[PDB]
Design an enzyme around this catalytic site. Structure first.
Site, short mmCIF file in Angstrom:
data_model
loop_
_atom_site.label_atom_id
_atom_site.label_comp_id
_atom_site.label_asym_id
_atom_site.label_seq_id
_atom_site.Cartn_x
_atom_site.Cartn_y
_atom_site.Cartn_z
N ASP A 65 51.71 56.41 46.91
CA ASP A 65 50.83 55.39 47.56
C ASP A 65 49.42 55.73 47.08
O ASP A 65 48.88 56.78 47.42
CB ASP A 65 50.97 55.55 49.06
CG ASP A 65 50.07 54.64 49.86
OD1 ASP A 65 49.19 53.96 49.28
OD2 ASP A 65 50.29 54.62 51.09
N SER A 142 42.35 42.11 34.31
CA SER A 142 42.58 40.67 34.51
C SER A 142 41.42 39.89 33.90
O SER A 142 40.30 40.41 33.87
CB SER A 142 42.55 40.41 36.03
OG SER A 142 42.55 39.04 36.35
N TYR A 155 39.10 39.74 45.04
CA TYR A 155 39.95 40.13 43.94
C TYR A 155 39.12 40.36 42.67
O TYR A 155 39.20 41.42 42.03
CB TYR A 155 40.97 39.01 43.66
CG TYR A 155 41.86 39.34 42.49
CD1 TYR A 155 42.83 40.32 42.58
CD2 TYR A 155 41.70 38.70 41.27
CE1 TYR A 155 43.64 40.62 41.51
CE2 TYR A 155 42.48 39.00 40.19
CZ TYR A 155 43.47 39.96 40.31
OH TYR A 155 44.26 40.26 39.23
N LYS A 159 38.45 43.68 40.27
CA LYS A 159 38.80 43.76 38.86
C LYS A 159 37.54 43.97 38.00
O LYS A 159 37.59 44.73 37.02
CB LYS A 159 39.56 42.51 38.39
CG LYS A 159 40.87 42.31 39.18
CD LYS A 159 41.78 43.52 39.01
CE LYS A 159 42.85 43.51 40.09
NZ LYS A 159 43.73 44.70 40.01
C1 LIG Z 1 41.05 29.65 37.32
C2 LIG Z 1 42.04 29.54 36.14
C3 LIG Z 1 43.39 28.99 36.58
C4 LIG Z 1 44.13 29.98 37.49
C5 LIG Z 1 44.24 31.35 36.79
C6 LIG Z 1 42.93 31.95 36.27
C7 LIG Z 1 43.18 33.24 35.49
C8 LIG Z 1 43.98 34.25 36.28
C9 LIG Z 1 45.10 33.71 37.10
C10 LIG Z 1 46.22 34.47 37.28
C11 LIG Z 1 47.34 34.02 38.07
O1 LIG Z 1 48.37 34.66 38.18
C12 LIG Z 1 47.22 32.74 38.82
C13 LIG Z 1 46.36 31.73 38.05
C14 LIG Z 1 44.96 32.31 37.74
C15 LIG Z 1 44.11 32.48 39.01
C16 LIG Z 1 42.27 30.88 35.42
C17 LIG Z 1 40.96 31.24 34.72
C18 LIG Z 1 40.41 29.87 34.31
C19 LIG Z 1 41.38 28.81 34.93
O2 LIG Z 1 40.72 27.58 35.20
#
Ligand SMILES: C[C@]12CC[C@H]3[C@@H](CCC4=CC(=O)CC[C@@]43C)[C@@H]1CC[C@@H]2O
Ligand SMILES: C[C@]12CC[C@H]3[C@@H](CCC4=CC(=O)CC[C@@]43C)[C@@H]1CC[C@@H]2O
Lengths: 278, 278
Positions: A65, A142, A155, A159
């Protein structure tokens, strides 16, 4: 001997798929310690391991953990080889919603798991790598750590924090022979409306719906297979001189460049508001 | 009526100087709530306030510990006007040293104060601004929130986290009439070797010394007066359409552009290792 790998957060997603990719490698180069917060969640990992015919002893599970430094130290002591060649800091939590609708505990938990838990792992395993003058550290990143996303405030805070943590360490670690890399992932295949509505205003609530609809469309169109994402970790591991960052996709580079090119942030805020909300 | 301003972390440095700049403004436009974690530290603030002849009632002190949501809410209730026109999230902690030499409590505290404390302030005061459709939020940023600095791993994690937090909120807040801005500061005029040596290796210890010597030279050459830094906050406050970021200096822009131009991070890591260590 085998390359000893310890991975955090292997109950599902990227950590699960990476663990079984490495343990099932045809060359049998890796010994993998797949760590999980709760061992009751290890079933999918063992189902996946059997499906890829991971040889006996190629994969072991440990309870770990990242919120608890005693748990981190007990897992480190369970590495029978007495060394970790590759540490993969992957454990992480998501948190989505209007900022004022997020519970204080949930906020503090995202930061403790995603940021302080990675620090705990690095404090526990870095010293041995620095004294040996070798070791690879891979951190699951991410696109939300590179650009701010609405309704992902905490979040993204977490990151972005890993970016600063890892970049700061990479400047020091350069001449030590210890290599740290972030693997920047986009979407990867892996509260109730009523409660959200009670904690925010109707306009923010409507915007949250729009965000969710947009997010689902992008996920549907652009999510990558976990096998493809796991292979980026392997690519970083095999590089003789790994870079600080690896990208699993180039899809968001344009938004990133626009972000980085206008330091006032104006172009990015306008572009992302339009991208999400229309 | 007067513009009501609430500022966190006013015992010294930027928050102290901003508070007295606003309260002593010749136009008497501002009513300032200068908040401090411990009221026993308010003496320098009142000495500075008297030196600038802040009119009676232009400045009030409140106890506010950003680690405690009850303290945040009690301070909000002490705003007699029932509204905050400008919120300045400035409370923050530094943390310097080899990552493995930092106490777990100290790490968790930097994150709780710098990141979760800003979230607590935003959850407490944002809703009223969104419903009114007006309000300015200024957040004290650092060049350490834009680029990683060796031996500042956790401090940079926390300042990078504010970047992600604020950028994510700014995308949502665009059409609400609520303006959020980061004020990116460089150096501003404002454990024992034995314990550090016991918790790290001799090479890291030597590098820490080099970092400290370099940092002191840059601080000596480039630290800005707090009056000049406080005036950047005022500039952001008076802008009709404030940008997400304001820079107190252009000195680190070149390093920032190099950083942003090579997304692999290689150029930045090499350049900053050379810049700090020679
Ligand atoms: C907001 C976004 C669509 C949703 C994406 C995001 C990148 C990261 C991401 C990871 C996920 O698992 C869900 C979708 C999201 C949250 C994208 C970056 C630009 C795009 O418009
Ligand atoms: C590391 C550095 C010198 C030390 C600076 C740092 C920017 C921020 C900073 C603020 C301080 O108050 C101490 C000095 C430091 C830590 C600088 C960025 C580039 C430069 O080489």
């Amino acid at each position: 001997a085998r390359t000893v790998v310890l991975i955090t957060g292997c109950s599902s997603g990227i950590g699960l798929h990476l663990a079984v990719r490495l343990a099932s490698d045809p060359s049998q180069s890796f010994k993998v310690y797949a760590t999980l917060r709760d061992l009751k969640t290890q079933g999918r990992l063992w189902e996946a391991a059997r499906a890829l015919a991971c040889p006996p002893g190629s994969l072991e599970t440990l309870q770990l953990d990242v919120r608890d430094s005693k748990s981190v130290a007990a897992a480190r002591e369970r590495v029978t080889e007495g060394r970790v060649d590759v540490l993969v800091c992957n454990a992480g939590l998501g948190l989505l919603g209007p900022l004022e609708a997020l519970g204080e505990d949930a906020v503090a938990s995202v930061l403790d798991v995603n940021v302080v838990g990675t620090v705990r792992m690095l404090q526990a395993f870095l010293p041995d790598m620095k004294r040996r003058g070798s070791g690879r550290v891979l951190v699951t990143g991410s696109v939300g750590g590179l650009m701010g996303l609405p309704f992902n405030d905490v979040y993204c805070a977490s990151k972005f924090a890993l970016e600063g943590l890892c970049e700061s360490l990479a400047v020091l670690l350069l001449p030590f022979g210890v290599h740290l890399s972030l693997i920047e992932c986009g979407p990867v295949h892996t509260g109730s409306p009523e409660e959200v509505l009670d904690r925010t205003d109707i306009h923010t609530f409507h915007r949250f719906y729009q965000y969710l609809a947009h997010s689902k469309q992008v996920f549907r169109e652009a999510a990558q297979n976990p096998e493809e994402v796991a292979e980026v970790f392997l690519t970083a591991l095999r590089a003789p001189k790994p870079t600080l960052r690896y990208f699993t996709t180039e899809r968001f580079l344009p938004l990133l460049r626009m972000r980085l090119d206008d330091p006032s942030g104006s172009n990015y805020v306008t572009a992302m508001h339009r991208e999400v909300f229309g």
